[PDB]
Amino acid sequence: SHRKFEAPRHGSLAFHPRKRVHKVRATVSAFPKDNAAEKPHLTGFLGFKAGMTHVIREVKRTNTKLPKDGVLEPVTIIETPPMVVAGFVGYKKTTTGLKPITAVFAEHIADEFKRRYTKKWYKNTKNQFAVHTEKYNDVKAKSKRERQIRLIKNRCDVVRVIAHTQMALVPLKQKKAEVMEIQINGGSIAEKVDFAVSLLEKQISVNSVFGTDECIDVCSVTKGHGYNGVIKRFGVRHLPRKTHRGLRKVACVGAWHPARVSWTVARAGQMGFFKRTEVNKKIYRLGCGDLKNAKTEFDITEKGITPMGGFPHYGVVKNDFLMIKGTVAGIRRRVISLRKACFPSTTRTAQEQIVLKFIDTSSKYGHSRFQTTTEKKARMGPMKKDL
Amino acid sequence: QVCAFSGFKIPVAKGRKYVRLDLKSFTFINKKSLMQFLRKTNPRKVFWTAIYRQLNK
Amino acid sequence: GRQGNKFRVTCGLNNASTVNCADNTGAKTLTIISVKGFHGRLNRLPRAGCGDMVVATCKKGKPEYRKKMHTAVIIRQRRTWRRKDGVTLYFEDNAAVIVNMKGEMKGSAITGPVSKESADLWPKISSNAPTIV
RNA sequence: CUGUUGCUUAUAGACGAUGGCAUCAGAAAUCGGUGUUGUAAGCCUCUCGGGUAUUGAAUG
RNA sequence: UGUCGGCUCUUCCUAUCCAUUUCAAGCAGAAUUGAAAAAAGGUAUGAUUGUUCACCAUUUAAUAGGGAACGUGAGCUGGGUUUAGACCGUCGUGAGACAGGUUAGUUUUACCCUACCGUUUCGGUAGAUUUUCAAAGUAUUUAGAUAGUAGCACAACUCAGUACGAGAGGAACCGUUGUGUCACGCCACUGGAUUAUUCAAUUAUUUGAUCAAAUAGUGUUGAGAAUCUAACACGUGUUGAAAUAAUGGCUGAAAGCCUCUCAAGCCAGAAUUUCGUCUAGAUGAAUACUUUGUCUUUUUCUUGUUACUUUAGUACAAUUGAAAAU
RNA sequence: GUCAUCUAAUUAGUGACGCGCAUGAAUGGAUCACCGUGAUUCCCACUGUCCCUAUCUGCAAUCUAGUGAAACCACAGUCAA
RNA sequence: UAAUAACCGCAACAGGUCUCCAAGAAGCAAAAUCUUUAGUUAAAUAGAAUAACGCAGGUAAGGGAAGUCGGCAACAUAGCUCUGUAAGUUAGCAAGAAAGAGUAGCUCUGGUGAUCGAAUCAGAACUUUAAAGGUUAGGGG
RNA sequence: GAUUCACGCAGUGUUAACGUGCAAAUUACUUGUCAUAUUUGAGUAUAGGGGCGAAAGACUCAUCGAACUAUCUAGUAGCUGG
């Protein structure tokens, strides 16, 4: 018999199997399509979600009924200290997919990068890249390096640099760096390798990768939740109060004669630690250089992006950061893989210039009232504690 | 904006506004001030409000 | 008669919700039956917010209005809804005024304030409202 | 090299697993910042006081 | 083989109700009617009734029809039916009967195998020798056969009181702005929970009184951080190429003309398909370090792997396999 | 069943009508104040019944040390036709 | 012993089984709640963690039965004093009908007796978080 | 043979718990009842085509539309199994 009334199915079948990832960092499944008629550039970065705040922005779109005094929107702060380029790898297009041909690394490698190659650092001999560094300038090793460069320039189509973060610049307790491959999109393979060679051991800032008011894609791992039932995992309807043996379950898990439970039925299991990609995430503030603060042209009081009392569970942001509109997957301290838009948005709101009128920096705990700690003391006056 | 009960300076995009049938609208900094107003509590008798601190000293 | 768009207003009035009639046309209260433009979902009751057109029956009022189905526009609601400029507000009571499909008010006056959401969509309501909040 | 073990470990979690650190480690109080309540006890004033504050908050 | 319906939930069919693309009309416009492609997405809220059904009141773009042991009771419920009490009507001399009515009437078990959903553990894919090489172990960076797939729909402005029409009436493409729902998230702002029995007040009892408490299994109330969370807050899925279906066409025979082709060759054309993008993922690849350099098995140490240790045996550089297209 | 009324909407309720398949007078007919862990319908009030779920506590379930059953069991255990 | 282990139920079974004596607070009350004399802290094992789904107890924005066979379950009302109380009726009732107002703390005054004492009732100032509600405690038509 | 609360008792609902249970009928909450047609002990009387029944074919030692026990009895079986 047919179901009496029709309704959309609960949950998406585009996200099955529903299994938690193992690594915290999420690798981008794809990079923006290469164009061979432009200067070489990097198409991605790596940041840490400091937290969220809210801003007021002036609306520049025309023919809109939005208030002329600004609109309150949420933003997400992603701290992005400069990354260090440790090497690059060439890829070749084979009949089985991209195949890495060779990888060329720099002479000097930081200990944060080396920690990635062990599972117990303090019990290790800590001799990663030791032979590579020791005989870097040997004539036999120099010729091998030059051949590796020549081989990539002849039998490769994709060039990616190996860049890692400097964990000493973030309040994270972790010391082992996070390594990402950032693809180079630009001219021929000859001038792409030349670009990567010049990038060895140099520091790349987030302003060199992303522009102003640029919609980007963010890849990260969602906040974990553990074992969960079908009400939270999928969103099925709760059963009546009269129900024997429980309310928060799917009543019928299949018909008699497909003879088995289907993959499409809602079941209890892990929800949480999933990798998700979101596209068309507009950058509100490129927090580099003169924009590293939280002051605006309308609100000219000098203040950093860190809220009063610090970011909850995170700390203080003192490096370059991204002000991404809205929400991104994952809790604070989670590594976020930024990436240029795979499909550049062409709507009027995507090209709209962003002009912020106010950036909230009050405490994120409780019902705060003051934007700075100096204005709190000024309004409260001398307290008996100090007085 | 200034809170109706406490008299504090309401930070932007914070608090709630209450509109009455006598064409009068009030804004409050939090729920704590809103309930005290709804109970007809006199802000002059509540110590932490800015109205009280202005009356004496 | 509805003019222009309306931003997201959380609909605090359900099916069978009783609202007051702010007009002077002999109707005291109206109970919401359906909402114009509502898109049905399984087991979901119709929802109405400020500035929404509803189908209501008058269970309390003059004989020419009682036991009859009317059309009314919600002008205020006790439900808290947030504006686009980060302003969060709500009213003391849920009220409505009887208007027809063409959008003109059957009454001639409105008692109490009228939300800006309902005044912008329906010009005839804004002309008869004392104060817009 | 890897595993166990320790941090009554977390960005994780039914148990496994996963993530981080392991002597320049970790833990702890104390102090400062940050919040909540509403003005402590002895003698309206002391008093924007006192108390709490990671436990899944942020410094030193 | 637990016998109706409803609730819940997934999937399937098309004889398609809506949205997409087309052709025809007794198609001027608008509204409609007949038909083709197409089943990827949608298809509601209620009064009465146990009802399936039915019939009304709305709302909607539409509120289509059906299957899966008349799907679905160790999933629920028990209103219907269908034991044992009782009442009424009719029938029977009577006990009793009634696809007649009314009322009250116990809904058991999963800890087993598999399926599904998540989660561990051990094992692992044969033909390369330019020492700048080759192979194994550990680790990271990646890779992507295959499997799933997601965004839809509506409204407002302008077009425009224009096209069309005697008039009455009355559109549409582009462009812009929103909303609803589905999917994935998220804690800034707004709201909810609250044993931080946090802070304050207070009823009863007991601490000789004050202070400070405890008890009434969380005494109660007010405010209430954190954390969790909203159908109640708020972000993203307006996103691109190529080939197509019905169909409409180009060139063009058969068949000197004609013809979109039951011919060769092409074009435009879908909520279509495939790439592109998203999630899971097999055999894999690169690099870093430790080794090893003809080869293995059986023992044996370690949580385990590799190198390693011993006794043997075994081979020893040199003619090996390419047109492409038709 | 027909007409009213109850609702926006009434196979339910109530008031009338009565050739009543098949009512009817101690097979007792009609009437009903008070009473009822009796049956039925509608108002007010109230509320997680519901829109639509969120969250808090205790005891379990999870894991572990000690202890330790039973039902059932032809052999067993992936699917399409 | 006379029973949450001596009795009857297969047992140290939350079942059943006749009596005697009987403190304080508070209250109308042998009610709920707390305590004294007496008894007991053992009564089919615990520790860590704080998943789902449960059993028991709660709360909740806006709406308010739209859920459902059906207001099932839960919420709600609730003590006392004063005012007031309809149709119907077997004249007895309906009736606590329905409906409305009051209630705290502190400082006082007055009334109710015998030849010093009883808690009870009424009234008046002032203050506050405006008062039955911790527990107990009718929903009404 | 008025209305209520309490000690007790019952069993209206949850069609709650449990349903290889604490229990071969119990537990929790809600509800009802809670002295004169009331509750209750012991003694005593009534016995199976019988008793007793404010009547349900109810009860008569977990057994009742005819108890339990033993004998006739290895009752008969055109039916099922070996």
What does this entry look like structurally?
Chain B: Belongs to the eukaryotic ribosomal protein eL24 family. Chain B: Residues 1-57 form the Large ribosomal subunit protein eL24-related N-terminal domain. Chain B: This is 60S ribosomal protein L24, putative. The structure is cut from a larger assembly and holds chains A (387 residues), B (57 residues) and C (133 residues). Chain A has 8 helices and 15 strands. Chain A is an alpha+beta fold and 387 residues long. Chain B is globular, with a radius of gyration of 11 Å. By secondary structure, chain B is an alpha+beta fold. Helix content of chain C is 9%, strand content 30%. Chain C has 2 helices and 7 strands; from the N terminus they run E-E-E-E-E-E-E-H-H. In chain C, strand 5 (81-82) and strand 6 form a beta hairpin. Chain A binds chain C through residues 5-7, 54, 56, 65-67, 69-72, 237, and chain C through 4-5, 7, 41-43, 83-86. Chain A binds 5 RNA strands through strand 2, strand 3, strand 4, strand 5 and helix 2.
List keywords for this structure.
part of a larger assembly, 3 chains, A: 387 residues, alpha+beta, 6-stranded antiparallel beta sheet, 6-stranded antiparallel β-barrel, 27% strand, globular, C: 133 residues, mainly beta, 5-stranded mixed barrel, two-stranded antiparallel sheet, RNA-binding, 60S ribosomal protein L24, putative (chain B), large ribosomal subunit rRNA binding (chain C), 60S ribosomal protein L23, putative (chain C), Ribosomal_uL14_sf (chain C)
